[PDB]
Paper text:
GABAA receptors are chloride permeable, γ-amino butyric acid (GABA)-gated ion channels that are responsible for the majority of fast inhibitory neurotransmission in the mammalian nervous system. GABAA receptors belong to the pentameric ligand-gated ion channel (pLGIC) superfamily. The large number of subunits gives rise to many possible pentameric assemblies; nevertheless, the most prevalent subunit combination in the vertebrate brain is the tri-heteromeric receptor composed of two α, two β and one γ subunit, with the arrangement of subunits being β-α-β-γ-α, in a clockwise order when viewed from the extracellular space.
The α1β1γ2SEM receptor hews to the classic architecture of Cys-loop receptors, first established by cryo-EM studies of the nicotinic receptor, with a clockwise subunit arrangement of α1-β1*-γ2S-α1*-β1 when viewed from the extracellular side of the membrane. Three dimensional reconstruction, combined with judicious masking of either the Fab constant domains or, alternatively, the receptor transmembrane domain (TMD), allowed for reconstructions at ~3.8 and ~3.1 Å resolution, respectively, based on Fourier shell correlation (FSC) analysis. By contrast, the density for the TMD is not as well defined. While the M1, M2 and M3 helices of all subunits show strong density, with density for some residues with large side chains, the M4 helices of the two α1 subunits and the γ2S subunit have weak density and thus we have not attempted to include them in the structure. Nevertheless, the density of the M1, M2 and M3 helices is well defined, allowing us to reliably position the helices. We note that in this receptor composed of α, β and γ subunits there is a breakdown in 5-fold symmetry observed in the homomeric or di-heteromeric Cys-loop receptors. While the distances between the center of mass (COM) of two adjacent subunits are similar, where the COMs were calculated using the M1, M2 and M3 helices of each subunit, varying from 17.6 Å to 19 Å, the angles in the pentagon range from 94° to 124°. Looking at the top-down views of five central M2 helices, the two α M2 helices are located away from the other three TM helices. The asymmetry in the TMD complicates defining whether the structure represents an open or closed state, as the M2 helices lining the pore in the β subunit display a similar orientation as in the desensitized state of the human β3 GABAA receptor, yet the α subunits are farther from the pseudo 5-fold axis, enlarging the pore.
Author numbering:
A (entry chain B), D (entry chain E): 10 to 302, 320 to 345
B (entry chain C), E (entry chain A): 12 to 307
C (entry chain D): 25 to 323
């Protein structure tokens, strides 16, 4: 029953509306990020969804004790009665604290004065994805830790562990992308109001090529089969020849309307559309040689044009 | 230790139901908007999305002091107990106030008595466009804001810096896909209501479409059809019914261009520019096809 | 600091959980609204969204104060410490008030005891199921409210002006149809807990035919002319006329589905599927005649 | 005036967390539901949205008063200062109280002590959807009213008014389904913890056949044409007759895409899909055997078996 | 009358923010669940749904009393005052604590000092499904939950009844439509964290895909197409254009059905068994066109 009087001594006389070590030096805040999972990437809304432990720690004079030897894990509702930093995320769109039983707020106190505050939060952060080249992607999806109402002479940030402040990157299993590297960058960013610390957790996303590369082969094999249908046959039964070239536009249409819901209406550069242009202009070239009718010469010229086409595609892929 | 007594001195009888200057002059509100990223524009819902740092500031004579420091960067829990203006967006649809470890509200008192109060908000608003230039139109999305319960004889809005230099895109705050942000234009304005006359700060964002694949993916399957129309009328040395079935594809391509356009724009009553732009391309087809069907 | 004294004198002995006129007065309340926008009638949920400025006015024998102040303006912070009458919307699916940036709650108190109050509300209300004539649309779209707790013997709603008290000044406000007029209606509905007055507000609309003009023209200017050139072509070749007729009904099928794709299915006919089915069965009868002519030419 | 000090003594000395007759007889609770609308019966998510005027009433000797012969409707800021029963719904997913001007929370008091409580609740309740027979299937989706933390020795539920406790059901209109009957069940459920009462409100939903017969009759003309063109064309250009029946296979594929967009994957096979796939296999095999080998036999075989398939389909459909 | 006078004696001196222990015995909580239902799996975004009752029980010596009856039932209002552990799910990405007229939380205080505290929940947890065999899926979906701030030296979770047999209860109501509940397997573990060491209660749900949902939906059209692949071998040697045109008309539907089978299928880099089934169908197509071009 000794601990209750000490906690009441710590609370009676405390002001939540002041930062610790007030009127003096800036206080440091150490962060730690435990990425649970990249929850949901969305190429429609130019964004992704992340679930992580955001842990942070600092030091104060207002909370110190000497009687209790061990550390003091305390209830989460004392966070409404203790000072915390106003750390936010810049590129977010919709975020929340998980409240499945309570607010997941880890409050741990030390006899020194080291105060620990932990959250399990899910953030839907935007990522400026450049969709110019589709097979290779190499994104840079940032995650901008930044204070809100404290200037750089009032606060400073640091990674608690350097590279060791970020834990759990290798345990991420994404069905659509793959991590190749992650980077933690500190940066001082000024505004009209003032200067602010800004940590950045960035990482690249190499797309898992197998799913879309098995979706890519089907129009190519389809149009090679269509070329071999329209090429080898004699044209006395010309209705057998022309009905092959009739139904090519619906085959192009199915793949185009399937991809049009996946990728948005970005006008700039679409590499899938460049590939489908190399396909459908080749469809028009096959029909052009048909209306020009040399059939065996066009049949031999079709595979070497397909080979130079997907060689151009492969060198566009490997850059 | 001393600052606790200081802040307790500033609440001995302080009220929040009264603006500073009742029975006195009106209140002066400096206002600044620092946008972060101009988001996506839902043309199907004629609304856009934008992330702002909404700064606003006002002098309050009830809070002067002679303390050791001049400006104290207080917490927003103090700002919940202070008077604030009732600013709101006149055309906002679903606006969110971002909440985190603390709510994204700031407060900086001054020994003069002047304040500073910014809110990291995300506001979406309807941008009522017209489709008279539906391929390559350009519009000015509005953003109107002002008081709700305080008349022009109660509060007065004014931009903080010069109005040419008071809405700032950060460096590259562009979540835009279809459009190109180029400029902006603010102004004041007094709107008479059934209650009174409220002052309104109005801001227009001028934006114009990228030409791009919105023209390419619509004109190149039309380019293949108009090339097939020239290929059909080239010669007649070969068989004639090889040409007639060539019309049939140009039927179904008219299907594919029909579905590809309607999924972006809302169902409007008035016809647009791109609809006639593809209607003339449709009219180029079946006239020559009926002509060849009559003569052959 | 005079108003600080006056308003704090208006706090003790005043319960914020009671209506003022518990006695013989039935607490009549005037009301109005200013329609800011009427959003899209999506018709999949058969609902429509609408933004209004909704305002109420009543009296009190417990808030009369002294002179030298005609009316005092209040923020959104005295609404919890003052009794407010209930108002709830009947056909509201999700009527969420706007709470952004110190929320929209305007309040005024005169010396007489008259209290003005207002809000800023968006509604997604049900309108009707009017699918008799699909081009000839005429929806009334009622909007109605009552007190959820207080009956007609304890609360009374009243307008400010007979049938034209609702201000509405806009031209482009997400209306894909044509708004033609509005009116009010005051009724009393017998419920189980009591009897409650209902203040119905209609919004007369009519669908502009220009939206369905593109949906009607381009199938009509394709299928009918394809059926015409199926007969106008030389019928000596079997893969010309029958093939054109059989690909025409292949094209004519999916446009009926896409024309009924954005809007949900109904039980009764809407006289639009009947409007396209006549031409569909006409091209089908052209197919029947073409198949009949084949039986007596290949002898 | 005089009423305020009577309300004050009802608020003074009251304990919220103690039920009436705590340690005595079980309290008696009468409930009432008023269906406002059946909003959307989502077959894919297997749920329905219900708007309801939920209503409770009970007895409390602590909340009576001597004089003032009238009923005291209060503000909704007394329900947080009074006891309410913890009545939840079992199979809900998204449920909330509407907050239009305030929380729609009616408190009505009485001079004897009968407390009336009322809410306006929208509930997205899930129900079992057996999709073996698709037309005229009584889905029998229910709503399960149940208390949470009071054993049957502490509470008593009943329908307030008998069978007339459920109103407004005849005033409901659906574009797809139709009310045929509703029923109230009052049972007891034993858990590991204890015994709890349960009310259950059922809804058997006769689906209106008009949308169903439209989406049935629109593809039936296609297989009718598939029979007729196969019976009607001479077999010199036999590929010109067979290729139309193979385009009916992709017509079936478009119908199957509409089916997959309209229905999920279910182990118990439906009643709509089976006759269309059965007549599909028959009209394909008829074209196959016609191209296998003939003009009169095509006129004789296909319409008779077609009408036979029609009448056996109708006889399965009428059940 | 009497119980209010003793609940104030229970609340007198009981700190609402401290667990029993702290230089004393390790706090033990007894954990029980009750699966109300098991919601549908969402294979596109690779998650599932569950809604359960979640029970907890522990002893607090600072809550014993001497009353007339044995156990004492309370509301959720008093339950917000007694210290409860921070039990969170490791796999839940979006969860709701349901409330309707009250928070769905009861508090049963025994006279011995123990108490029961349960809540009705709903968890949208996910499973890392491997997709090497989509009709032959066999998955063990985890439902890990532990403490959030209290160390293994602070609290330890323990199942109430028989762990491997009767600590988890399926209540025979499942709204599933693609899978079926084979069984369950609880587990205990210790996860070494960057903060400290924490107990972990694991529960796996063994699931296999039903056979009549999509398996027949793929099995019927592929058999239809391989039947249509045989007629070209049935064709005459004097009927050479029909054997050519049969193959393209076969693949027109094969491509659309492959698109439809990959439509509801989520994205995976690993190959699926039905991807090899459509490959066998395409190989039959390739053999048919080889036998066609042999004549040609
Ligand atoms: C099941 O559990 C959930 C989770 O707790 C409950 O949801 C919460 O319910 C409470 C009680 O109703 C809400 O608290 C109240 O919130 C008022 C405004 O808060 C707004 O917060 C944010 C913006 O800051 C919005 O997003 C919220 O909107 C959400 O909720 C609405 C409700 O319908 C939804 O429709 C939306 O879609 C959002 O989901 C809220 O609008 C707040 O003003 C109020 O506080 C006043 O009253 C209390 C008690 O008197 C005191 O704290 C205090 O007096 C406050 O009064 C001050 O301010 C007023 C302003 O007018 C002044 O007049 C006063 O003088 C004084 O200065 C209260 O805190 C909470 O917002 C809500 N949370 C969410 C996420 O929904 C469910 O209700 C619950 N279900 C049950 C019980 O059935
Ligand atoms: C944005 O995030 C902030 C994070 O701090 C959040 O502020 C917190 O809100 C909660 C309520 O939502 C506050 O909790 C209250 O604290 C007071 C203090 O005395 C209590 O009296 C209140 O008790 C009420 O609710 C209890 C719930 O069990 C019941 O006992 C009873 O019904 C009481 O009426 C209540 O617990 C908390 O203090 C703040 N923290 C601050 C301001 O630092 C804010 O709500 C978030 N805004 C959103 C989500 O819009
Ligand atoms: C995503 O893009 C950002 C910027 O476009 C990249 O940030 C940049 O990272 C490099 C490497 O750390 C920084 O270079 C060096 O930074 C240190 C620390 O500040 C500095 O001392 C050196 O002089 C040098 O500048 C660079 O400054 C930084 N730029 C910015 C604007 O922050 C980031 O690395 C990219 N992430 C991925 C995964 O590609
Ligand atoms: C289909 O709907 C019916 C009602 O529309 C429901 O079945 C009901 O189930 C309850 C319990 O599950 C039973 O009610 C019993 O009634 C008897 C006689 O009144 C009573 O003595 C029992 O104590 C019990 O209350 C009964 O099986 C049945 N009741 C009725 C009136 O049909 C349920 O919603 C659905 N049932 C099925 C089998 O799908
Ligand atoms: C209280 O918490 C502190 C902070 O982590 C602990 O101090 C560290 O404990 C780790 C345990 O592996 C050691 O490796 C570090 O060397 C310690 N650092 C310092 C500066 O002491 C401390 O051990 C905890 N005490 C208790 C009783 O749990
Ligand atoms: C207050 O409410 C009670 C409860 O309904 C009313 O008592 C009943 O009222 C109905 C219709 O008014 C009639 O059945 C009887 O007058 C009452 N029946 C019983 C069994 O009490 C009461 O009338 C209401 N008070 C007033 C003033 O109307």
């Amino acid at each position: 029953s000794y601990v209750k009087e000490t906690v009441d001594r710590l609370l009676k006389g405390y002001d939540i509306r002041l930062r610790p070590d007030f009127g003096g030096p800036p206080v440091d805040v150490g962060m730690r990020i435990d990425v649970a999972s990249i929850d949901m990437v969305s190429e429609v809304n130019m964004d992704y969804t992340l679930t992580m432990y955001f842990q942070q720690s600092w030091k104060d004079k207002r909370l110190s004790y000497s009687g209790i030897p061990l550390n003091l894990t305390l209830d989460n509702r004392v966070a409404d009665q203790l000072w915390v930093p106003d750390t936010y995320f810049l590129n977010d769109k919709k975020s929340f604290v998980h409240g499945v039983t309570v607010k997941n707020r880890m409050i741990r106190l030390h006899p020194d004065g080291t105060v620990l505050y932990g959250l399990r939060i899910t953030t839907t952060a935007a990522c400026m994805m450049d969709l110019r080249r589709y097979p290779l992607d190499e994104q840079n999806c940032t995650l901008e830790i930044e204070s809100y109402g404290y200037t750089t002479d009032d606060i400073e940030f640091y990674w608690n562990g350097g590279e060791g402040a970020v834990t759990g990157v290798n345990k991420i299993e994404l069905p659509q992308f793959s991590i190749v590297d992650y980077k933690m960058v500190s940066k001082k960013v000024e505004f009209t109001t003032g200067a602010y610390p800004r940590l950045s957790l960035s990482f690249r996303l190499k797309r898992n090529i197998g799913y879309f590369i098995l979706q890519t082969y089907m129009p190519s094999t389809l149009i090679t089969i269509l070329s071999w249908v329209s090429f080898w046959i004699n044209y006395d039964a010309s209705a057998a020849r022309v009905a092959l070239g009739i139904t090519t536009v619906l085959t192009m249409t199915t793949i185009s309307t399937h991809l049009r819901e996946t990728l948005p209406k970005i006008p700039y550069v679409k590499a899938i559309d460049i590939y489908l242009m190399g396909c459908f202009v080749f469809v028009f070239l096959a029909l052009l040689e048909y209306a020009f009718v040399i059939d065996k010469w066009s049949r031999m010229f079709f595979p070497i044009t397909f080979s130079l086409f997907n060689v151009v595609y492969w060198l566009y892929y490997v850059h | 230790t001393v600052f606790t007594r200081i802040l307790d001195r500033l609440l001995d009888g302080y009220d929040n139901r009264l603006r500073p200057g009742l029975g006195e002059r009106v209140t002066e509100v400096k206002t600044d908007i620092f946008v972060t990223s101009f988001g996506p524009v839902s043309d199907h819902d004629m609304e856009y999305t934008i992330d702002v740092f909404f700064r606003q500031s006002w002098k309050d004579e009830r809070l002067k002091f002679k303390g050791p420091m001049t400006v104290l960067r207080l917490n927003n829990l103090m700002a919940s107990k202070i008077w604030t203006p009732d600013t709101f967006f006149h055309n906002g649809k679903k606006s969110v106030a971002h909440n985190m470890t603390m709510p994204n509200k700031l407060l900086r008192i001054t020994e003069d008595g002047t304040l500073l109060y910014t809110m990291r908000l995300t506001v979406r608003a309807e941008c009522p466009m017209h489709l008279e230039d539906f391929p390559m139109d350009a519009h000015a999305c509005p953003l109107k804001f002002g008081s709700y319960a305080y008349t022009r004889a109660e509060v007065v809005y004014e931009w903080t810096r010069e109005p040419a230099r008071s809405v700032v895109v950060a460096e590259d705050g562009s979540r835009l896909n279809q459009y190109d942000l180029l400029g902006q234009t603010v102004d004041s304005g007094i709107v008479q209501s059934s209650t009174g006359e409220y002052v309104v700060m109005t801001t227009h964002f001028h934006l114009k479409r990228k030409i791009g694949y919105f023209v390419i993916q619509t004109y190149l399957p039309c380019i293949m059809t108009v090339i097939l129309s020239q290929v059909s009328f080239w010669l007649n040395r070969e068989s004639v019914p090889a040409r007639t079935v060539f019309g049939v594809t140009t039927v179904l391509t008219m299907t594919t261009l029909s579905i590809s356009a309607r999924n972006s724009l809302p169902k409007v009553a008035y016809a647009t520019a791109m609809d006639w732009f593809i209607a003339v391309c449709y009219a180029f087809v079946f006239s020559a096809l009926i002509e060849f069907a009559t003569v052959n | 600091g005079d108003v600080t004294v006056i308003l704090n004198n208006l706090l003790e002995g005043y319960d914020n959980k009671l209506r003022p006129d518990i006695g013989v007065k039935p607490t009549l309340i005037h009301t109005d609204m200013y329609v800011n926008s009427i959003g899209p009638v999506n018709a999949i949920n058969m609902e429509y969204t609408i933004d209004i400025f909704f305002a109420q006015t009543w009296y009190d024998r417990r808030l009369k104060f002294n002179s030298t102040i005609k009316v005092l303006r209040l923020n959104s912070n005295m609404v919890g410490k003052i009794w407010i009458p209930d108002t709830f919307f009947r056909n509201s699916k999700k009527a969420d008030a706007h709470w952004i940036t110190t929320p929209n709650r305007m309040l005024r108190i005169w010396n007489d005891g008259r209290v003005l109050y207002t809000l800023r509300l968006t509604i997604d209300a049900e309108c009707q199921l009017q699918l008799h004539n699909f081009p000839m649309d005429e929806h009334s779209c009622p909007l109605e409210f009552s007190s959820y707790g207080y009956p007609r013997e304890e609360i009374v709603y009243q307008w400010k002006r007979s049938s034209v008290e609702v201000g509405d000044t806009r031209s482009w406000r997400l209306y894909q149809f044509s708004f033609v007029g509005l009116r009010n209606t005051t009724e009393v509905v017998k419920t189980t807990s009591g009897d409650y007055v209902v203040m119905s507000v209609y919004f007369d609309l009519s669908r502009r035919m220009g939206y369905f003009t593109i949906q009607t023209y381009i199938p009509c200017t394709l299928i009918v002319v394809l059926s015409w050139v199926s007969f106008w072509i030389n019928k000596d070749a079997v893969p010309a006329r029958t093939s054109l007729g059989i690909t025409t009904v292949l094209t004519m099928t999916t446009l009926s589905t896409i024309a009924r794709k954005s809007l949900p299915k109904v039980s009764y006919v809407t006289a639009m599927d009947l409007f396209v089915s006549v031409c569909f069965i006409f091209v089908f009868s052209a197919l029947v005649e073409y198949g009949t002519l084949h039986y007596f030419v290949s002898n």
